[PDB]
Amino acid sequence: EMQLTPFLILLRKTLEQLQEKDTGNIFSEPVPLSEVPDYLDHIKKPMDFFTMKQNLEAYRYLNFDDFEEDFNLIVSNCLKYNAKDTIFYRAAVRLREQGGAVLRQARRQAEKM
Ligand SMILES: c1ccc(-c2ccncc2)cc1
Incomplete structure (x- = not known):
């Protein structure tokens, strides 16, 4: 029970923060079936x-x-x-x-919405 737009903004930011933890970018794109x-x-x-x-x-x-x-x-x-x-x-x-x-931090922000 909240507005969609602020929630999706939050998820976009959270996804960016998660991508930053994957410093080798090993999870940025699908696993290449050509090599695996x-x-x-x-x-x-x-x-x-x-x-x-x-x-x-x-x-x-x-x-x-x-x-x-x-x-x-x-x-x-x-x-x-x-x-x-x-x-x-x-x-x-x-x-x-x-x-x-x-x-956990992002979910606390969603729960305030
Ligand atoms: C090349 C690129 C990614 C991977 C891989 C990454 C994460 N999980 C499985 C395979 C293996 C070879």
Whole structure:
């Protein structure tokens, strides 16, 4: 129960803050199946920040949970596909940690709306 426009502005800013935590930009775009042809064998719903931006603008995020669910998919897909001893797996752990703080603050701002 709030205005749509300020909420989407908040999600756009939050998405930007999450992208800033991904300093290697390993989650900015979909995982390239050209270089990872087996990626879809067990990853049933790939996700990335560019796709999240498309979903945001397509009005697919009308509450904080749905936005946060796709961010969590970025993290969980990466933990699932990659071995624990890789840079990619550790990057997903770090994103989960740093992104979670971004999300908790942004959700507190949405709840004031
Ligand atoms: C090249 C680029 C990205 C990746 C990748 C990134 C994150 N999760 C799985 C694969 C692998 C090879």
